[model samples]
Target: STGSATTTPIDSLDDAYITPVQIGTPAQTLNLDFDTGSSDLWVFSSETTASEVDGQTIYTPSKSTTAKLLSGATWSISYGDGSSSSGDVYTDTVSVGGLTVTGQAVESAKKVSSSFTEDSTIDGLLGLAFSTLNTVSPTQQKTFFDNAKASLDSPVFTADLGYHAPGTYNFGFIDTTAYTGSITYTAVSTKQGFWEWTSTGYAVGSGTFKSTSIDGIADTGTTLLYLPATVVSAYWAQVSGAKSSSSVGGYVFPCSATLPSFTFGVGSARIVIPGDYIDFGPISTGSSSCFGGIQSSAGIGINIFGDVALKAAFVVFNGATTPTLGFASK
Candidate 1:
C-alpha cells in the first residue's frame, strides 16, 4: 500500500504543506495538512456549519457507502497558536495518493476557530504521528499510516520539503533519489506521543559547531523552528537590525539584511539551513521589516523542529516497534 503525494506550501513562508487526500467511496478530495507533529486524521465535513466552512471542501459521510458513524465517539484538538477544531468521529475509506486504508478513523469537524476557517486552502489535517496520541474517545482508532503499515512494502515514510517549490510525502518506501548523501539515523522517544528526539546543538551561520543536547520534536504541523532563547538570540544577533519586537511578537529584522546560514548537528552529520529560508516573510504588507521563521520556545514547554528546519533536509519517520528518525541532505 505504498504511495506518494506531492505536498505544496500554501503560502510563501511555507506555513504548511498541504497534500490532496481522497476520502469516501465517490472520493471527495480535500487539501489536508500532512501533519507529523500530532495524531488525528480529522477533516472539514458536512457537519461543520456553513459560517465556519468558508471556501474549504467538506466530507459528507452520507455520500460514502463505506462511511460508518463511530457512535458516542468524539475528539478535539488545540494548537499552541490558539487555533482549535473539534468534532464527532467516523470510520471511512481514506487514501493518500494511491495508498488506501479502509475503516480509517476520520474526525469530521463540527466546529473550528477563525484561524482555520480563514485558511481556504486547507480543508483539515491528516496526522502522521503515533496512534497513541489519537484524540477519539470511547474507543480510540488507529491513524491511516498505522493501518496502512500492515500492508506497506516498508514501515516507513519520508518527508522531503522544498523551499518555495512543491515537496513530496512518500509512504512505505524511501526514494533514494529524493535525497543525496547518507541518511543519519537517530533514536526517537515516542512515549510522549510525539516524534521526540534530542538534536545536537546548532551554530549560527558559519560559526563553530556548538554541540549541546537539545531535545525537541519534529513537527510538520508547525511552521517555524522553535529552539531555546539562547539559540534564537544567537542566530538573530548575527543579522543586522534584528531585534525582538513586542508588537510583532517575535524576532524581526530588516528585509534587505544579508542573513547567514544556520547549521545544526544530528549524530555526527551537520544540516545547514540557508539563511534566506529563515526570513519568514514581511511583518506586514510591503513592510521593510520581516519576521523570522526561527523563534524561542521559552514558554512553549517543548522545542520544535518545524518546517523551517525540516525544509533544509530530507526526513524519514521510521515507525517500527522501536521507532527512530532519519535525516539526510538533499
Candidate 2:
C-alpha cells in the first residue's frame, strides 16, 4: 500500500496515484495515470514549481537518494483540451504503495499552460497505459510500463479507480476476486498513441442498439465526448429539444431526459458505461441543465470517451505485451 499523503507541487509528481512495486527489498512506487488514451507515466519533481503543477501530483525526487536527473533532456505533452506542458529529465528510487523499482526515470515538466496550471490541485499526471504514443521522442524514453514490462508480476498492470472518485484518487494492482473467470482482452496497437484508437462499435443495454454511425476510442486524458457533428446532433435529437454546443464545442443536451445508457465493444467483449458516467453536474452552465461531458469537437475528426465513459469498465494496460488494452467487468 502507498503511504505518503503530503501533496507536492511539481510537474510530473503531484496528485499522482500509484502502488508499490519491487525495487530491491525497500520497494519503489511508480507514478502513473489510469488513462485510457495513451499508456505512459511521468513524475513531477522538486525541480518544478507549484504554480506550474496545479491540479497534478508531485513527486519528491530529493526523497530518494538514489534518484538522478538527466541533463539536456526536454519533454512536452499536449492534451485534448488543448493544454500543454514541457520539462526536463529526472529519475529516482521510485516506489508506489508496496512495490518499488530502482532508477525509474521520468520527465519533470517546467512549463505549463493556464488550462493545466489553473487546477491548482494536481501536481502531475501518471500515465499507466501503453507506450507507443508517448509524447517523448528518442524511443529510449518509452514510459514506466515500457521499462517495467520485464519485472512486473505479470506482463500487465491492472487499474482499480474510484478511491477518489467524487473525492481522492486510489490506485492499486488487480483484484481478481471481483470476477469469477479470466477476462479476455484485445491487443493494444502501438502504431500510434494519445489519439490512436480502434472501435468495434457501440451498444446500449444488453448488446442492444448496435451502431457503426460512430467510432471512437476511450481516452483517460480527454475530459469530454467528441463525436462527429452528426453523431452529436443525433444523440441530442433523441431528446425533446436539445441543441448542439457547436459554438461551445460539445453535445449539449437537456438536463431532464433520463440520460441514455451506453457501452463499447472490444471485439467480443462489451464494456458497459452507464449514463451516470457522462453526468457532469451543472456548475452555473445554466441550471446544470447543460451537461459538460458530451461536447463537440467537430473538426477534430475523432471521438474519445472521457472520464464519464471510462468509469464503466475495468481497464488493463499491458505495456509488456506490445501495447494492448484489455477491458474487463467492473
Candidate 3:
C-alpha cells in the first residue's frame, strides 16, 4: 500500500498553509509551513535564543529520547522575502499526516530574522522541494518525502490550495474526487531547485494567447504571482487608476475599479485567474487603494506561479522518475 497523509492549512494567514507534524519519541507536535520553494526542514526549537523566539511553539530535542544531535552539522536559509533562520541539526523520527520517516534531519533553529520572529503562527518550514536543495553542511539531508518515497506505492503528491480558505496537500496518492476534468500534465525542469515549468504564453482579458514561452516555478510559499515587467504592465494597463507605486510597492489600483481576468497557457490547457484574486488586499486600513497580486519578477529572474495562480486550480506534484506537474480545474 502507498503511504498517504493529508495536510491542512492553519487558521491565521491565507498567505501560507501549515500542517501538523510530530518529531522525536513521545511525539512533539509542531505546525509547519510546507514550502515547495525550499528544501530544509528547520524549526523553532530549544536551541533558538530566548530573545529571538517570540510566541512560537518550539520543539525540544532533549525532551524526546529518540532525538540525537548531529555534532558539527548546521544549516542556514534565507527566503526571497528576506526571512531567514540558522541552526544545528538533529536526527529523529518525523511524522506528518500518518506517514513516518525515521532519522529525518530536523534542523533546530538557533537564530531567526525579525520577519520570522514576528510571525507567531508559523513554527517552522517543512520543505517539499528536491533533496538536492537541502542545505545541511558536511552531508546534505533528504527531505521527508525523499526518505519516504522508496516505500510508497506511487511517488506523487497533490497540492490543493484555496483562496482565503482551507485546502489539502495529499501525499503518495491522487484523489480523483478532489478535482474536475482531466489532469493536464507538463514537463518540469528542476535545475533551479524548484518545480519550474514553461507556459506557452498568456493573454490579458479576452485577448488571444500569444505563443511566447514564460519559465516559472510553482511556489506554494509565495503569496503573489510574479511575471515579467512587460507582462505585468500589459495586464494592469486595463484597469484605470492602476499604476506602479514606489511608496506602496508594486502596482496599485483603486479598490472599486474593475480588473480584467488574466489567462495563462499551459500547453493546450488555459488557466484563468479571476480579477477578484488580482486585487491582493487593500494598501492600508481605510484606504481605497489595493496592491496587485500579479507583479513584476524583474530582478527575481524566473516568474513565480505563486498562491495567486495555484489557487485557481488543483496541482499535482508528480514524484515519478521524471517529475512532472499536473493541473486541473476545481
**TM-score of each model, in listed order:** 0.99, 0.76, 0.96
lDDT of model 2, residue 16: 24
Higher-ranked by lDDT: 1 or 2: 1
Cα lDDT of all candidates, in order? Answer: 0.91, 0.53, 0.87
Q: Which of 1 and 3 is the better model by TM-score? A: 1
Residue-pair clashes per prediction, in order, are: 0, 57, 0
Error of 1 at 80 (Å): 1.6
The whole-model C-alpha lDDT of candidate 2 against the native structure comes to 0.53
Of the candidates shown, which would achieve the greatest TM-score relative to the real structure? Answer: 1
Q: Give residue 301's error in model 2 in angstroms.
A: 3.7
lDDT by residue for model 2 (1-330), tens: 322211221222112233323222233343334455654355555566666665544555556566576666667787666877777766555554434445655666677778656764444565654555666654446555555556665655554433124212222245565343456566544444543455566654443645563556656555556656554554555556566554644555567766666666676676666665555655344674556455655677677766555545555555553455666666
Ranking by lDDT: 1, 3, 2
**Model 3: per-residue lDDT, tens digit, 1-330?**
344444555542366777788898999999898888899999999989999889999999999999999988999998998789999999999987778889999999999999888888889999988989999998899998888887766788788887767778777888899888888999998898899999889999998787888999999888889999999999988999999998987999999998898988888898888888787667887889988989999988779998889888889888888999998888
Q: Candidate 3, overall lDDT?
A: 0.87
Model 3, residue 150: C-alpha shift (Å): 1.3
Measured by lDDT, the strongest candidate is 1
- The true-versus-predicted C-alpha distance at residue 216 of model 1, in Å, is 0.3
